[PDB]
A = this chain, B = another copy of it.
Amino acid sequence: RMRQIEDRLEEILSKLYHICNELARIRRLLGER
């Protein structure tokens, strides 16, 4: 189980970092307006 929690933390990380990139891209698009 600790190994599974670590893997789930990694999948969460991964998803949050994709979120940061899409947010940064929003922010860049808004800036071109």
Contact = CB atoms under 8 A, between A and B. Distances in A.
Interface of A: 1-2, 5-6, 8-10, 12-13, 15-17, 19-20, 22-24, 26-27, 29-31, 33
B27 A9 contact: yes
A17 B15 contact: no
Contact of A6 (B6, B16, B17, B30): B30
A10 to B, nearest CB: 6
B19 A12 contact: yes
**Interface class of chain A by DSSP:** helix
A16 B19 contact: yes
Contact of A22 (B12, B17, B29, B33): B12
